[PDB]
Amino acid sequence: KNLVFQIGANATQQISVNIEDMGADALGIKEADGSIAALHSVNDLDVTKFA
Amino acid sequence: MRGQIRGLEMASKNSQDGISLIQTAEGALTETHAILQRVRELVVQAGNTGT
Secondary structure (H helix, E strand, C coil), X not given: CCCCEECCCCCCCEECCCCCCCCCCCCCCCCCCXXXXXXXXXXXXXXXXXX | CHHHHHHHHHHHHHXXXXXXXXXXXXXXXXXXXXXXXXXXXXXXXXXXXCC
16 A cells, blocks of 8 residues: 655656554564564563563 | 629638637637646646545
């Protein structure tokens, strides 16, 4: 669903882009992963865990 | 002679009136054209606004 904008005055004169940010912006191959790579940003684990 | 002459004069009269007709038509087409230009503008804007 890419962000096609009008650029010129004729057909095909358009550019699209992409945006992606949220809490789960940690590592990922196509999506994030479980304990790592999502919750590193969503949780930031060190509640008691670096003790 | 006088037949061809009188009918000739009426033929030129006829011609100028035919001109006036097509001038009216083309004026309507001038405003038609103006609108279609405006539509094109609105489609360009529409294309940007699509995203």
